């Protein structure tokens, strides 16, 4: 008998039992946490650019492991039941490396090399990174405010498409 | 508390300048009598720096204001500095100036298509327009084929417009255009025009009377001055026919050598000068008139390394003490911008969104009911200019 795990998600009590059943089958070594080599084991995301950052941002106590209730925390970020702004500020915390609540000219470039590889030269990636951060800087402090981060792509749509079943 | 880090101070590669943060706002740019500063303008759009809106509709009403004044077709004298398409390479238009001479003591005449294709089209119409503003009377402007809603709305300047000021500073530009002259007689001698000629014009007249306040039509004589090019043949004919359907274009006429001949005669011209076509040398000198022993026809191409992947020389015509001479020029550096102006987050959004979402539901089949691209990516001559001539032609509707 242990203390009860407290969380904030979308899910129901059917839903998280299932969760919970995905996350001891992942959870090999059975340690109650989820390691970056555990989710390496799965083969579809051993060529996916983006799954540390993922990972670290479900990693929120910040240990580089991740327990259920981040895993529960971060599954539910993509819930058929969350709202636009949700969406966004997860897509936002992808370039947001640091989690300090802005965007810097330094994480927009290496999130973007990360995605981008060789394809474009330095240069020219350090280029557009400038303009595009320059354009929605609204207060002059040289980053990108969630606020001004979301004016900038909030009419895109794409948290449409952020959805999982569970 | 802290001030915040300066900006750069996790800036991946420092040695690429960094762009100008600020407008320029009016006091900087227009001195105590309402003149533009054209060198500070210069050194501002040079580091990629953007104007207050208010502005950018001030010079381009201003110039539109003064084009409108003006002849459909204009007359210039020499000495004269002649310049063919410039396509929105703004950081070439720069060393044209430094290769033809000051606005402040050279005349200048520019055969039109400032706009589309290269990605520093608003720049090109705010220097040149400035350049009108400060000398209305040495330095003169046509229109091209691509100053016009249709084409504008279809490449990339519509685009440009709304990203780097607003729609109202694309509409400023639809009139300005408008008001462009639409030919020049140069020294009594050549005529210029962007495009060529037309079969329903016969004789300087038929260009004097034509009403260009609007949007070119889809045929007739306007579109043709703008849209005509040489038949590929020009010179060594096969049919002797005058004009024909233009296949490239999709719209207009090819003209050959037999066409040139009667127009030169029946109007007294010793040839004819014009723009429209690339040029691997930025110019091309046409088969001689047996009459004069003079190029009947004249193309001169002015945006060198064209699309970034043509390699061509760009030139210009200077036109002094009885001599034609052409300068040739190479391209220059200029900065990176995203397909259509995107920015990183609209261009990298859907792959962020694409692959995290793919990663979750990887992550989630690993019970099967038991329950009971891998990179983002970017969006010589005979070989680009093929693979290019799609968009050389009216876009249909
Ligand atoms: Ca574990
Ligand atoms: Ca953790
Ligand atoms: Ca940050
Ligand atoms: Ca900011
Ligand atoms: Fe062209
Ligand atoms: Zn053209």
Same mark, same amino acid.
């Given at each position: ?17 299932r ?18 080599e ?12 983006l ?13 580089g ?55 474009l ?25 969630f ?10 749509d ?9 | ?12 590669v420092?040695?690429?300048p ?75 238009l ?15 005449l ?9 990605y ?19 330095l ?25 000021y607003?729609?109202?500073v ?45 949007e ?22 096969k ?16 003209? !050959?050598?037999?066409?040139? *001949? ?7 011209? #010793? +040839?004819?000068?014009?723009?429209? =076509? &690339? ?5 091309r ?8 022993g ?67 539901? !990887?992550?989630?089949?690993? *019970?099967?009911?038991?329950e009971?691209?891998?990179? #983002? +990516?970017?969006?010589?001559?005979? =070989? &680009?200019k ?12």
């Amino acid at each position: 008998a242990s203390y009860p795990l407290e969380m904030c998600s979308h899910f129901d009590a059917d839903e998280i039992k299932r969760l919970g059943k995905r996350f001891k089958k992942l959870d090999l070594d059975n340690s109650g946490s989820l390691s970056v080599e555990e989710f390496m084991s799965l083969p579809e995301l051993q060529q996916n650019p983006l799954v540390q950052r993922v990972i670290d941002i479900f990693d929120t106590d910040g240990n580089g492991e991740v327990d259920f209730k981040e895993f529960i925390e971060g599954v539910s970020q993509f819930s058929v039941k969350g709202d636009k702004e949700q969406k966004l500020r997860f897509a936002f915390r992808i370039y947001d490396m640091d989690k300090d609540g802005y965007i810097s000219n330094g994480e927009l470039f290496q999130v973007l090399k990360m995605m981008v590889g060789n394809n474009l030269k330095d240069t020219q990636l350090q280029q557009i990174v400038d303009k595009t951060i320059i354009n929605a800087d609204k207060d002059g402090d040289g980053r990108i405010s969630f606020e001004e981060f979301c004016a900038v792509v909030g009419g895109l749509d794409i948290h449409k498409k952020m959805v999982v079943d569970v | 508390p802290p001030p915040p880090p300066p900006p750069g101070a996790d800036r991946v590669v420092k040695a690429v300048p960094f762009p100008p943060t600020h407008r320029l706002t009016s006091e900087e740019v227009f001195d105590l009598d309402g003149i533009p500063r054209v060198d500070v303008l210069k050194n501002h759009l040079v580091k990629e720096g953007r104007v207050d809106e208010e502005i950018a509709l001030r010079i381009i009403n201003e110039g539109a204001a003064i084009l409108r004044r003006e002849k459909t077709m204009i007359e210039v004298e020499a000495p004269i500095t002649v310049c063919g398409d410039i396509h929105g390479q703004f950081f070439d238009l720069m060393k044209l100036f430094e290769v033809g001479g000051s606005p402040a003591n050279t005349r200048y005449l520019f055969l039109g298509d400032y706009v589309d294709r290269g990605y520093f089209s608003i720049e090109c119409v705010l220097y040149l327009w400035v350049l009108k503003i400060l000398y209305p009377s040495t330095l003169f402007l046509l229109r091209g084929n691509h100053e016009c809603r249709h084409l504008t709305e279809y490449f990339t300047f519509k685009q440009e417009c709304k990203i780097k000021y607003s729609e109202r500073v694309y509409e400023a530009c639809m009139e300005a255009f408008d008001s462009l002259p639409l030919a020049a007689l140069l020294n009594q001698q050549f005529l210029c025009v962007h495009g060529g000629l037309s079969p329903e014009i016969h004789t300087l007249d038929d260009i004097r009377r034509l009403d260009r306040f609007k949007e070119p039509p889809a045929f007739g004589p306007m579109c043709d001055l703008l849209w005509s090019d040489p038949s590929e043949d020009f010179g060594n004919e096969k049919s002797q026919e005058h004009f024909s359907h233009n296949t490239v274009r999709g719209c207009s006429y090819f003209y !050959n050598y037999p066409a040139v *001949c009667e127009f030169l005669q029946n109007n007294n011209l #010793l +040839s004819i000068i014009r723009a429209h =076509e &690339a040029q691997d040398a930025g110019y091309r000198m046409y088969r001689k008139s047996q009459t004069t022993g003079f190029p009947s026809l004249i193309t001169i191409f002015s945006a060198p390394n064209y699309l970034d992947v043509y390699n061509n020389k760009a030139a210009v015509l200077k036109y002094e003490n009885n001599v034609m001479n052409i300068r040739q020029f190479n391209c220059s550096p200029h900065p990176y911008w995203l397909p259509n102006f995107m920015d990183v987050f609209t261009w990298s959004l859907p792959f962020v969104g694409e692959k995290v979402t793919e990663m979750l539901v !990887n992550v989630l089949s690993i *019970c099967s009911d038991d329950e009971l691209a891998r990179y #983002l +990516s970017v969006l010589s001559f005979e =070989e &680009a200019k093929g693979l290019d001539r799609i968009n050389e032609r009216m876009p249909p509707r």
